[PDB]
Amino acid sequence: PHPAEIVAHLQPEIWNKVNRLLVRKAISEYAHEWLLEPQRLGPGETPGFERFRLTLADGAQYDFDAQVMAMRHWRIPPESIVKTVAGVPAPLDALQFVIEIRDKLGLPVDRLPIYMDEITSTLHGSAYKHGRTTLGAAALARADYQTIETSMIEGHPSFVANNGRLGFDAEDYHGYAPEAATPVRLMWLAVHKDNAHFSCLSDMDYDSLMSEELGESAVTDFAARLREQGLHPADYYFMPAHPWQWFNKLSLAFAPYVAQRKIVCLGYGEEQYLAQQSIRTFFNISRPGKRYVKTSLSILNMGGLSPYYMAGTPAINEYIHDLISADPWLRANGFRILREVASMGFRNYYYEAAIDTDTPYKKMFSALWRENPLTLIAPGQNLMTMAALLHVDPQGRALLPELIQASGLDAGTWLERYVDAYLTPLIHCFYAHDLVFMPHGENVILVIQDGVPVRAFMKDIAEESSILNPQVRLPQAAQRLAADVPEAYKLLTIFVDVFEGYFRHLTQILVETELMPEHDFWRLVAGRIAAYQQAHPQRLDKYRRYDLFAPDMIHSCLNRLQLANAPNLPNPIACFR
Amino acid sequence: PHPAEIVAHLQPEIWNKVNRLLVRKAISEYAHEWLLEPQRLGPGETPGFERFRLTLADGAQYDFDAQVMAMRHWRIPPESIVKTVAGVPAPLDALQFVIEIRDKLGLPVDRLPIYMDEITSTLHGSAYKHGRTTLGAAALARADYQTIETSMIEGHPSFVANNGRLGFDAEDYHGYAPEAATPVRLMWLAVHKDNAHFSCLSDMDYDSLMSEELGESAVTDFAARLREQGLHPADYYFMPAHPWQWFNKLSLAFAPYVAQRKIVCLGYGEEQYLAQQSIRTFFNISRPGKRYVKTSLSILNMGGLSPYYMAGTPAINEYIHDLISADPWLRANGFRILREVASMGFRNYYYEAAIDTDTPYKKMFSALWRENPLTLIAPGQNLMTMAALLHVDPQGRALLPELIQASGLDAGTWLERYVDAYLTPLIHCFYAHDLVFMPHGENVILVIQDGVPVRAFMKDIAEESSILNPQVRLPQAAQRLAADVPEAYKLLTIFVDVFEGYFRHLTQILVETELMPEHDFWRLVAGRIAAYQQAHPQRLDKYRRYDLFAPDMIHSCLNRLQLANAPNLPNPIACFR
Ligand SMILES: Nc1ncnc2c1ncn2[C@H]1O[C@H](CO)[C@@H](O)[C@H]1O
Numbered sequence A, B: 001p002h003p004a005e006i007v008a009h010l011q012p013e014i015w016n017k018v019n020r021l022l023v024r025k026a027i028s029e030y031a032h033e034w035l036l037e038p039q040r041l042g043p044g045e046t047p048g049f050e051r052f053r054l055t056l057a058d059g060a061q062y063d064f065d066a067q068v069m070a071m072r073h074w075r076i077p078p079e080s081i082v083k084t085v086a087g088v089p090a091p092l093d094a095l096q097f098v099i100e101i102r103d104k105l106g107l108p109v110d111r112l113p114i115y116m117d118e119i120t121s122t123l124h125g126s127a128y129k130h131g132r133t134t135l136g137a138a139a140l141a142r143a144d145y146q147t148i149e150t151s152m153i154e155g156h157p158s159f160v161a162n163n164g165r166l167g168f169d170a171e172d173y174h175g176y177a178p179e180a181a182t183p184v185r186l187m188w189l190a191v192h193k194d195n196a197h198f199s200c201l202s203d204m205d206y207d208s209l210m211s212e213e214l215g216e217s218a219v220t221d222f223a224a225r226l227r228e229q230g231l232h233p234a235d236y237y238f239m240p241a242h243p244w245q246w247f248n249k250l251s252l253a254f255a256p257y258v259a260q261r262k263i264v265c266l267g268y269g270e271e272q273y274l275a276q277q278s279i280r281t282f283f284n285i286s287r288p289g290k291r292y293v294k295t296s297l298s299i300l301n302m303g304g305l306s307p308y309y310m311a312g313t314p315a316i317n318e319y320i321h322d323l324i325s326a327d328p329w330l331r332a333n334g335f336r337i338l339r340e341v342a343s344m345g346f347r348n349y350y351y352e353a354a355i356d357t358d359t360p361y362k363k364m365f366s367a368l369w370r371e372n373p374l375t376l377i378a379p380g381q382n383l384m385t386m387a388a389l390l391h392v393d394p395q396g397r398a399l400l401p402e403l404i405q406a407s408g409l410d411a412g413t414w415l416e417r418y419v420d421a422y423l424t425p426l427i428h429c430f431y432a433h434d435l436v437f438m439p440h441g442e443n444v445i446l447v448i449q450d451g452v453p454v455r456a457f458m459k460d461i462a463e464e465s466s467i468l469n470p471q472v473r474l475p476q477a478a479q480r481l482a483a484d485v486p487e488a489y490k491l492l493t494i495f496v497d498v499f500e501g502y503f504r505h506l507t508q509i510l511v512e513t514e515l516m517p518e519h520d521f522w523r524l525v526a527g528r529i530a531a532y533q534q535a536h537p538q539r540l541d542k543y544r545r546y547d548l549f550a551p552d553m554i555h556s557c558l559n560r561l562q563l564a565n566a567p568n569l570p571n572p573i574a575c576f577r
């Protein structure tokens, strides 16, 4: 393999294209979070926009068109952005922009080059994604679950430096990046019960999980392998790992355990998987209806996987699932979690003895198995990550209109179906159960039926969910699920993760594609919320206490939070109270 | 390739062996630096030693034999060390020891796991080196230059965490670790003159260097390659890089430059190299008398390579070489530097604009060529790293006695030859020229003639050398060479880098192998120094001002300095004044 081929995707014209796209996002999102305060100049190059200026690193100047939409959202046509340096035209360069605003960023000058490296890696991935052979909007909107999953481009829509994958070298990138869509086999390891522990749903056990996941031959073959090298299979579980994790972290940092045979490399599994958008979660493409496998993966990307939550994970999941199943409204709506049914943690007592506090060092060797949603839908239904609604192909065409065209519904009707499948159950979960998730594009999977959103699956459960009520009666293993939260913070999941985190980006698509005016979308959302409250009038106490129609709401600045690693925003639905 | 094979060297018995060796070193070196204060218990298991105790992490206890030699040196027989935890026998475990002394180490609890990872990697390498097929002491003492180079085991003899190679994953390790002795081909890159700059000796040029290093075919083929992809060779130099650096750092962090064709990957060179003990320096094994190539390599090991010194490197080297050549005493002794004859730096203007201060980020893409010493010795001479004198094979046999046996000389005579080849020229360089180096085991190469040390080569010149006289008249390019140093610090090179850094470990070998008593070695050294001063009586002013026979000397604590990343010691030669 010629050593140049790993960066063949890095060419001048494509680099320039993705840089312009990222400068737009950086300007939009930093402005949104008050890191940038653009100065209005006059009317825009495009009619209906106004022109703004940023005057930066003593020389650098960026003029652009913007329309400032709800929640202080800067809608910026990428082609409108004009950089000059002391009166001279200069190409848009996203790394250079971040440098020009380094003082405004507030980065200790030793985390700065790290953040620069994340921007660069984000660009490098973006170049690859825009250059690769891929389906356009029309075709993608009609494509299967996994084709859609691996064809996503944007990543998290608010984080500028959202796609770092720092730790993957150039070859790792092509084997393991979700966007390379290269089948991956998991690494199987025998893990000593001195170090390893397993948890699962009450109706299952380790042996039945393995029977299902590996089969009798593979499991027999593993025990034999161990016994054949003089070891006692009775002392071990079998545990999957990301191959990168094995070569980069476990064979090395965990050398004492390998040396002492507390970890034994058994080799690659037979079945092939595709990396999901989360990178560390894998979908089995070899065989039907098998669970996802989520592994620990020590790369930097905005922020591994811990065994101390791997003790209580299935129990948290069993509780939430039984709760949702026993609720007649949720039953009727069809909203459902995908259970993390079994988890396993290898505990590194060296790191645990050295560090008493929370650390990524305790989270380097864990696995869980997650329910496969294909098994839970009907013929004539398909699945897609909710991130797909925000998708724009390399030609600049949005997926959403193509999906709505295929459904045969007007945008209003389609959007109502979507809101009641996605937003309404979250609101019910909060009002009825104080139960909250992390409801972003990557954690939500929509069940689609001939173009129409019918219902939603929620994933990423044990690590993201809370019951906002310390009095809730929880099984002993699930206790962490309960949380005691300031009043102002209870509705954050809607205000922060739904409205500002996801809907803010959706309406920009709605407006660019002329599917619906912004005011019409917020009115639609307010109406779905109001219709819910009317159908469940007995929780008026809670509707008034936690007012979704309050004039303003807490603004969490995601990038500023990543950079550290604001005043209230007006509520877009306030005027519909 | 089975994924388990990369850690086949990690087995229980070998792991235990290398752990015991590292615990010994950690105890010895930390005690030496006052991090540990062992408490005398009584007489040793071995007669002539005393027994000491360390009482640690509330439970852990280590008893051991020691003999405290000059410069507060703790000579500790590895097999004498006995660990108990609350009265119960426990295996020696070096990672565990470091944890047990974490409070004494004074590490912010976020650098701690990093230091732990360095210890672990040091152990992992040590396991490999002790397990590999290798020459014993007798054979090694008679072996060729490169066999000796790749067969070194210890590394830096004072640093506990001396062999980290953090950044190499498990496969990288087998391709690129000096001890794996796997031939390496360099990666060739076309580097744009917008970014790249070249310096060399006044009697040479870029084109003659390349003619010699690559040849006309390879250089022609490179220009053609560039021209063939639509580029202009007139705009570029050709630059070598470590293949790991390309896959891990340059193709990724330098993506904008790759994308903009400021860096073009040309592929692997035809000629094969072996990694030297420095890891980033390569010796050409394909063809006779070619230069070493030193490349930038962004791994963690105790502390890359910078282009801002790559501008002045050959000029510093040309100055020092002409100085040594013009000096009749140095001429007569035969001491010589190996010139860094040409250097090249690629400048990353993104990092340079973001960070005004010294950083590893500015040092990621550089190369230099160094003079090959094989070209500078006679038939019947051989070369060996001075680190070889400290070498102990996996059977516990020392190389030094075997070398002395082969020479036919008594230890006293051999040692005198050695001191006058190594130490005396350093002393002259200081007294006559205020010229100092970094004279450790890895920077010094001895010319050996049928077992006898005849003279020494010094390498690592531009980055390590200083003229301790701000008044020295230096060519404009070499100005950094001059230094203005506190009085107490002028003789550091002898007191710190020679006596405490290297001789302290040598006498432990001399004593373990019964080659010479410690007092006899110091008397020998004092005599060589005194004989030098008598032969050059006109610098008595300087002998008195910088007294090598002062009662005590500054003690630099290397590990404490690495950990952060003491009172004076008695001078071992004071009593010979
Ligand atoms: N559309 C998306 N929305 C939210 N997070 C995303 C999205 N795509 C990828 N991610 C994230 O998934 C992981 C967060 O757990 C990270 O890898 C981060 O990239």
Ligand SMILES: Nc1ncnc2c1ncn2[C@H]1O[C@H](CO)[C@@H](O)[C@H]1O
Binding pocket: B154, B155, B156, B157, B162, B163, B277, B278, B279, B301, B302, B387, B440, B441, B442, B443
């Ligand atoms: N014997 C030695 N003496 C001093 N430094 C050594 C020795 N062996 C290896 N090194 C060091 O060489 C480099 C220091 O520039 C590091 O890779 C470090 O390991």
